[PDB]
Amino acid sequence: GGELSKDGDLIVSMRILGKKRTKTWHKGTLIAIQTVGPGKKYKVKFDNKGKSLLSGNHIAYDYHPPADKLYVGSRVVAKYKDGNQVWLYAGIVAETPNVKNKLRFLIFFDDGYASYVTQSELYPICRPLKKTWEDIEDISCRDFIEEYVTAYPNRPMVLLKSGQLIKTEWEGTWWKSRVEEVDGSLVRILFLDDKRCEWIYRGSTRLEPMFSMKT
Amino acid sequence: GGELSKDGDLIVSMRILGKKRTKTWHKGTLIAIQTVGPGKKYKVKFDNKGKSLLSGNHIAYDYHPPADKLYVGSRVVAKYKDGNQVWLYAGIVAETPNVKNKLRFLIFFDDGYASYVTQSELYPICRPLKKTWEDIEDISCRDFIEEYVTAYPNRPMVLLKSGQLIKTEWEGTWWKSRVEEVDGSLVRILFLDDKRCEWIYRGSTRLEPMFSMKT
């Protein structure tokens, strides 16, 4: 048949996080295990009342990892903050806590976003893929992460000082912009015409000095 | 073979909007059409270097529709202002302009979010399905749109006044909240513990007065 009540520490009735077809993740109850095909799928009833039948890399434990289980390449779910709102989104651990990053984790989310995060804002995916980047759906992000992880600890970055004037790419074009803050391996950029800010990785090829170091 | 060059008014080298795997939409160029089986798929090079072969309900025109073409149920793409950046996301027209909503379109986005927007924030999807909601991926949201569109002009809603105290739902829990503001078919809710604000449709069972009437 194929009706398990256990699979390792994945035990029906447990509480768990699950990835919804919106790409955000939500708490739920694991109500079933079904072998289908070569492997197993985990059925989540969400506290927000939907249901999904999910592969093991689209569920996560509802506890925070022990730092010192996480390493570069770890597949995680992490907290993103819209200000007051909090959301849960998948990503990759690009750095672990050190002195120069103020003992935080650098997360590269599957939509290309990047941010520093605490141990209490993380959740370990339950059954990640051997090559953990291989379930990143945006091809351009998967590739940046495969390159990054495979080259690590090689990590080219341009240096930047507050105030510095550079061009930063966005939606295919280059924009007059300004370096308005440095935090570790991230830099905050002000797009001038339009007044947006965002945090960008300093090894990112959207920064012109880094685009031009490399070509 | 099946290598047309102009399907309807879709024509190679035109500017178009395309849906990425992030679910967010982005500008590129239509670089080919391909017959596949019953119909055709449309290949898009994005300004941000990605390439995608896309069904015709996942591309939108780069122009704003004429109001009066939009009926309730129209499959559109709409601007979403996430703090300081602007994003493009898909949805369904819930309401067309009138007095009460102050000549705006109510948009039900594919992720369950609701908001009012102008004609200049909308883009028509090139080739929507007959039943326009069937390419909504989250089942909970698809079910609601379908019910909504089908019951229309029926539109149950609760009356809420500013300062009212009600419990509102979020991630399976009911929360102490306050009504801050009423905009047409929407209410802005303060979640008193978290200090969050959300805009919520007044026909949402997340609103405990709706949760009880509907029961």
Ligand SMILES: CN1C[C@H](Nc2nc3ccn(C)c3c(=O)n2C)C[C@H](c2ccccc2)C1
């Ligand atoms: C991790 N993501 C980040 C997205 N926000 C973002 N992405 C990128 C990529 C590159 N940049 C510069 C940025 C950026 O500046 N922002 C703000 C929002 C997304 C989300 C949020 C709520 C609901 C569903 C999806 C979660």
Ligand SMILES: CN1C[C@H](Nc2nc3ccn(C)c3c(=O)n2C)C[C@H](c2ccccc2)C1
């Ligand atoms: C249309 N979406 C809305 C999401 N924001 C939102 N969704 C819901 C649903 C229900 N509620 C109450 C809310 C809510 O309050 N917010 C703020 C953000 C999402 C996005 C943004 C950037 C990148 C990728 C995706 C676009």
